[PDB]
């Protein structure tokens, strides 16, 4: 996965050289940037189910027709598996926080997203604004330094969906 450490190593590897000053510079930046990110991951993980419920009900409130009979949100399976999808997005945002890179997002979600959304007719907007709800909720769930990191990854997910 593409992180700071891995990107450093791959760059110093493809060039066939040892790790010089700039590479250890970036590595150190990652290592001390870790602690806010780890705390953000702990908070998001602790507040996981509440965040998922909130994002699901935000999808339904903003997209009221979706739960009406005959289309996507109708029926219990599609709601339970909406919860599943939001849980996946949240899990990979925390993964990307811990790794301090957009590796896990760009691998397990962003890579191959448009094809599977197209082939299942899943509107991206549902996920974009569920991520917007989580983006807002981290404002009162986190604060300080780690809030910028969490917002940054929620943000990258939203941009990739759009």
């Amino acid at each position: 996965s593409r992180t700071v450490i891995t990107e450093v190593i791959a760059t110093a590897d493809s060039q066939g050289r040892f790790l010089n000053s700039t590479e250890l510079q970036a590595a150190f930046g990652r290592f001390e940037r870790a602690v806010p990110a780890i705390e953000a991951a702990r908070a998001l993980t602790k507040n996981q189910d509440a965040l998922v419920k909130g994002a699901v009900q935000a999808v339904f409130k903003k997209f009221p027709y979706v739960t009406q009979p005959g289309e996507k949100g109708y029926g219990d399976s599609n709601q339970a598996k909406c919860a599943r999808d939001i849980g996946y997005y949240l899990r990979f945002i925390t993964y990307s926080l811990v790794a301090s890179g957009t590796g896990p997002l760009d691998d397990y979600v962003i890579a191959g997203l448009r094809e599977v959304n197209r082939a299942f007719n899943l509107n991206p907007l549902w996920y974009i604004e569920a991520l917007n709800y989580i983006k807002g909720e981290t404002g009162k769930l986190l604060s300080g330094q780690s809030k910028t990191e969490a917002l940054l990854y929620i943000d990258h997910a939203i941009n990739a969906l759009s």
């Binding site: 450490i5 590897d13 040892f18 602690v35 925390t94």
Partner: protein, 172 residues
């Protein structure tokens, strides 16, 4: 390619669950003590010619039948390839030391090296001996207290030794 964080993440994802509190504690400790890791990786990077040269001196002063005619390090092209392999293995050990995970080593240097050395006739026992000699020369350099603050890094010594032993045991 991997590191410690991505390894824990991959395990958790294959299982399907968020990262537990204990694993977050482990990764936080790793990141907190990674400054010593940067010093070790710098000790390997900055002295690498010394490691390679001392290991070569010792290897060719104990195993003469490599530099003899018909030995498999005889001409300058084979001796240069010997030294180049030594440097490359040391390079991937420093990589894996920075990453904290030996996946880059096992994927770029070690996944086809025993077969290559057998297909070239190079005695993989002597290659492993060269790797161990590089390990010794490096440990002389990672324990250097000059230009760095005093502290304990027994964990990093053990980790680097295990990377050198992985290279040795996957070539031999």
């Amino acid at each position: 390619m991997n590191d410690v964080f991505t390894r824990a993440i991959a395990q958790a994802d294959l299982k399907g669950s968020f990262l537990l509190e204990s694993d977050l504690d482990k990764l936080a400790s790793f990141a907190k003590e990674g400054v010593k890791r940067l010093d070790a990786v710098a000790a390997l990077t900055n002295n690498a010619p010394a490691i390679i040269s001392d290991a070569a001196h010792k290897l060719f002063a104990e195993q003469q039948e490599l530099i003899q005619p018909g030995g498999n390090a005889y001409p300058h092209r084979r001796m240069a390839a010997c030294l180049r392999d030594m440097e490359i293995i040391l390079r991937y050990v420093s990589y894996a030391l920075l990453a904290g995970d030996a996946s880059v080593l096992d994927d770029r240097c070690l996944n086809g090296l025993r077969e290559t050395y057998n297909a070239l006739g190079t005695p993989t026992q002597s290659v492993a001996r060269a790797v161990q000699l590089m390990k010794d020369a490096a440990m002389v350099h990672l324990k250097s207290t000059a230009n760095v603050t005093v502290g304990d890094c027994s964990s990093l010594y053990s980790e680097a030794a295990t990377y050198f032993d992985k290279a040795a045991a996957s070539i031999a």
